[PDB]
Design brief:
The protein has 886 residues and is α+β, with helices and mostly antiparallel strands. The structure holds calcium ion (2 copies). One calcium ion binds at residues 46, 66, 375-376, 380, 382, 384, 389, 432. One calcium ion is lined by residues 46, 66, 375-376, 380, 382, 384, 389, 432. The PDB classes it as hydrolase.
Length: 886
């Protein structure tokens, strides 16, 4: 085909010869594993993944399947989600601690709020192994070598000339046909000779593994030692025209292909995992999995390469091509095009041209969308983990050979994985996250009982929404590991659930979809019930006059075990906000919205049995929300991180806060979640926004110099800065992520490789060009909720450009063209007919007018007390409105 217009990451040498000189990080002491993370090119179908090395002779595709997880039922005889009954005492331990805080304690020792001690029960995500395609060349001398990742077509390509013959390789993983394809060619008949093997990683425990050949198919199968999970992979080799010979390798164990010209390999893998509490198994036998995997490769071969490839590209491109961004970038087809590793190095050196700078920025942005398609499909069994689905490291136990188990880290990281999912028009890719959080409900009720005394009768059978609450913490797995971890500071964080419910609720916010409303309403209802009934209390003297969440830590500074904090109260505020919105949208069938009549923190008074002593008092969602008072501006003009805080880093009396990083540059900004991702601190509130900008500047600058960071920290700061409207600072953060936190394969790093920052980048660029989360209040006091904000934080660096296919809440598809730093055209497609309300930050919307083609729309200009303006107008589903300067 014509690929000149496609987006490529491309390299002029194999992975083995690609620069892997950036910081390796923990677990990457093996030069070979470090080389994997910095140089290989990922692809996937949401379920299986490969990372292509592009080696000339011993070619290698590191292989993953999303469900290959140790831990869980079968890892012990008593697996119970890590919950420690002796520590939790059915809520008694937490209750006693909160009473101390209520009676005036500033801090308590939260040391016994722990669990999850058994690393075998926790487990971790495993690298499955490798596909090795050994051409058995005498040397690796080549010319005209290239390897690429075609982001537009979802496939990896390798080409080179060796001893008069041109060898090509193409790799993709089809979602529609559930199968990995390797298309391999030589330019001369009989010159394609290779050995096919697929060894499982040797660093995890396996029982009864066998490798059998039954040309045309190689099968590896066994069960995991740690938990008995059955696994099965197969490679079917189809000689393209039955030309060439298929034999068995001398080792076992491999398939040899001789004297061929071209072949297609069909690769499949599965386990008997099911996301289903409490057994987490399909109930299949090994033979039954073997048969299932066999049907995948056979079906694909019956379809054939042309049809499978066509179906793959149609499917991949349908999602990939929804968004287009032009900031003036060069690309792989440009005259004087630069390979992607050389591009990164030029960007780091300061010698990249404007076009090349825009190419790197724009490629990293696109890669975040690409990586979502590869790791998180609407039919994936699990959401993307700390590494999407791609890993090379393996070991049996949690906190072992793989950094943080490549797990589901739900106190910023899993959240970040789903920051760009809706705004960058990949909404259905959020489905496995929604299903994952749904999946936490049953096991989470066990935790909620043990640690907070919220008992759901028969947690297994009680529908989501009808139980007493579900609790989960930071480290999560495939197996309902909802217990807190073994040390409080990093292990305990029940507001992780509220937080991930933002990602979930946004699936409804951006779509208006009725079936999603029911699902998000059920999750929000039970979690809001949980907080109102079991987690909120009237604060003691240290935290002023308010309900707080009680025993808390602000990751990861200050005192352990304070009386609530801004981080948690901001999250609980948002959750109640969204639960109320969801209930209103349903006609508040359960009568839970209530009001603020006779509403007081005293209404939460409990006896020693945990029962309310004023049982019939108002504890409705509206009342509880109103009592949080999450944002308090402190004596330094900052957002307080603690309710006992005065000036920054100090208590009200001027003494210093212990555990506060006194240089003011603590890496986390847990108290700013109301600015991003939430709706608590917005451009529409200058008091709060000015204070949030003050907090951000203290955290992010040393002197007047903006500081670099990596991984999730830089991703969070880009998005947080975007919400302020400071496009220039936001952009300088983007530059700093590209310079200091991207490997040659554009994997984001911490170090080591962590995918969160890849997805965070894509989201941050979205939030520069379009915001949709805030609420505008006009001079008449009318609210415009989730108004469309065009170019809210456009950097001066991007003087002109266009973007199309972004999504705004209310379900509008948005395109924008700008020149000389100001919008020239907005194209707003109303997908659901919701009333439009449009701010034009780069232009002033009062200077614009609205048309439906030739029809002039009678848009009204409304303005707020601060003198900013919205264009408001009714819309019809399916219609595009063009907004242009008068
Ligand atoms: Ca997945
Ligand atoms: Ca919202």
């Amino acid at each position: 085909g014509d690929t000149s217009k496609d987006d490529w990451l491309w390299y002029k040498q194999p992975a083995s010869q690609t620069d892997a000189t950036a910081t390796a990080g923990g677990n990457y002491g093996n030069p070979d594993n470090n080389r994997w993370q910095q140089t290989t090119l990922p692809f996937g179908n949401g379920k299986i993944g490969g990372t292509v090395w592009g080696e000339v002779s011993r070619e290698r595709v590191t292989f993953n399947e999303e469900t290959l997880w140790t831990g869980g039922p079968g890892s012990s005889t008593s697996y119970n989600g890590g919950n420690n009954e002796t520590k939790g005492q059915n809520g008694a331990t937490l209750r006693a601690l909160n009473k101390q805080l209520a009676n005036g304690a500033e801090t308590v020792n939260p040391g016994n709020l722990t669990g999850g001690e058994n690393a075998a029960e926790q487990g971790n995500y495993l690298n499955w192994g490798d596909i090795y395609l050994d051409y058995g060349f005498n040397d690796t001398t080549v010319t005209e070598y290239r390897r690429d990742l075609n982001l537009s077509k979802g496939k990896a390509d390798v080409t080179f000339k060796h001893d008069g013959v041109t060898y090509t390789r193409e790799y993709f993983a089809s979602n529609p046909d559930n199968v990995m394809v390797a298309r391999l060619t030589a330019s001369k008949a009989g010159k394609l000779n290779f050995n096919v093997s697929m060894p499982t990683n040797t660093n995890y425990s396996k029982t009864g593994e066998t490798t059998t050949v039954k040309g045309d198919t190689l099968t590896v199968k066994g069960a995991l030692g740690n938990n008995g999970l059955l696994y099965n992979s197969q490679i079917k080799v189809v000689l393209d025209n039955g030309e060439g010979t298929l034999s068995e390798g001398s080792d076992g164990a491999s398939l040899k292909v001789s004297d061929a010209k071209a072949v297609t390999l069909y690769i499949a893998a599965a386990t008997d995992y099911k996301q289903k509490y409490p057994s987490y198994r399909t109930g299949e036998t090994a033979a039954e999995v073997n048969t299932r995997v066999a049907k995948v490769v056979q079906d694909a071969a019956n379809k054939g390469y042309t049809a499978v490839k066509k179906a793959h590209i149609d499917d991949h491109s349908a999602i990939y091509d929804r968004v287009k961004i032009d900031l003036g970038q060069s690309g792989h087809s440009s005259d004087g095009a630069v390979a992607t590793d050389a591009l990164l190095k030029a960007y780091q050196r300061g010698s990249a041209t404007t076009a090349q700078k825009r190419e790197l920025e724009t490629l990293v942005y696109k890669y975040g969308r690409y990586l979502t398609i590869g790791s998180s499909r609407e039919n994936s069994q699990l959401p993307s983990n700390l590494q999407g689905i791609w890993s090379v490291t393996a070991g049996d136990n949690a906190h072992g050979n793989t950094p943080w188990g490549s797990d589901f880290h739900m106190n910023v990281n899993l959240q970040m994985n789903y920051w760009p999912t809706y705004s960058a028009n990949m909404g259905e890719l959020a489905e496995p996250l929604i299903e994952y959080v749904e999946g936490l409900v049953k096991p989470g009720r066990v935790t909620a009982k043990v640690y907070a005394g919220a008992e759901t009768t028969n947690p297994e059978t009680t529908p989501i929404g009808e139980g007493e609450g579900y609790m989960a913490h930071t480290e999560n797995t495939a197996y309902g590991w909802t217990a807190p971890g073994q040390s409080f500071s990093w292990g305990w964080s029940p507001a992780a659930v509220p937080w991930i419910l933002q990602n979930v609720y946004e699936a409804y916010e951006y779509s208006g979809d009725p079936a999603l409303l029911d699902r998000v309403y059920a999750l929000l209802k039970e979690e809001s019930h949980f907080y109102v009934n079991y987690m909120l209390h009237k604060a003691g003297s240290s935290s002023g006059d308010r309900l707080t969440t009680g025993v808390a830590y602000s990751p990861a500074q200050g005192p352990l075990g304070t009386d609530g904090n801004t981080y948690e109260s901001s999250l609980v505020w948002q959750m109640l906000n969204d639960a109320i919105e969801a209930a209103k949208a349903k006609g508040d069938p359960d009568g839970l919205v209530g009001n603020t009549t006779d509403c007081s923190a005293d209404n939460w008074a409990k006896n020693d049995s945990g029962n309310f002593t004023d049982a019939n008092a108002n504890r409705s969602w509206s009342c509880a929300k109103s009592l949080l008072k999450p944002i308090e501006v402190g004596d330094s003009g900052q957002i307080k991180e603690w309710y006992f805080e005065g000036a920054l880093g100090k208590k009200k009396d001027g003494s210093t806060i212990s555990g506060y990083q006194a240089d003011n540059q603590h890496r986390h900004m847990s108290h700013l979640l109301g600015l991003f991702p939430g709706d608590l601190i917005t451009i529409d509130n200058s008091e709060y926004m000015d204070a949030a900008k003050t907090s951000l500047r203290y955290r992010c600058f040393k002197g007047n110099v903006l500081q670099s960071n990596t991984g999730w920290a830089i991703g969070q700061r880009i998005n947080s800065w975007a919400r302020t409207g400071d496009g220039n600072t936001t952009y300088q953060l983007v530059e700093l992520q590209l310079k200091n936190a991207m490997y040659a394969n554009l994997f984001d790093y911490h170090a080591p490789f962590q995918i969160d920052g890849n997805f965070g980048n894509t989201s941050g660029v979205d939030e520069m060009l379009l915001q949709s989360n805030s609420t505008f209040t006009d001079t008449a006091g009318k609210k415009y909720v989730n108004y469309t904000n065009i170019l809210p934080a456009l950097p001066d660096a991007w003087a002109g450009g266009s973007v199309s296919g972004l999504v705004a809440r209310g379900n509008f598809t948005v395109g924008t063209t700008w020149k000389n730093g100001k919008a020239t055209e907005v194209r707003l497609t109303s997908n659901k007919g919701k009333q439009a309300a449009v701010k034009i930050t780069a232009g002033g919307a009062q200077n614009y007018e609205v048309k439906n083609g030739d029809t002039a729309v009678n848009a009204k200009v409304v303005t707020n007390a601060d003198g900013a303006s919205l264009l408001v107008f009714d819309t019809t589903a399916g219609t595009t409105y063009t907004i242009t300067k008068k």
